[PDB]
């Protein structure tokens, strides 16, 4: 529960960083930690990507089931086991 509030507070600061005047993304891809500080400690490795579409965003969490995403683009989280 923590790793997918981290993923999901990720994904809130990512698209607080789009531009306001084009809507363009900030420059991707980045570690989590660039957006929120300090994940939980079930989080290995964190990063937002972008996606094709040049207006959404994925960020994925890797555990140590295996990962969570979350995809901007249908708004959901998903889980990798």
């Known amino acids: 529960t923590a790793a997918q509030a981290y993923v999901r507070n990720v994904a809130t600061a990512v698209e607080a960083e789009r ?44 555990l140590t089931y295996g990962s969570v995403s979350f995809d901007s683009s249908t708004g959901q989280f998903s889980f990798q086991l």
């Open 19 to 62: 531009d306001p005047t084009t809507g363009a993304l900030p420059q991707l891809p980045q570690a989590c930690d660039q957006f929120v500080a300090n994940p939980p400690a079930s989080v290995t490795q964190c990063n937002v990507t972008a996606n094709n579409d040049g207006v959404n965003f994925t960020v994925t969490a890797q």
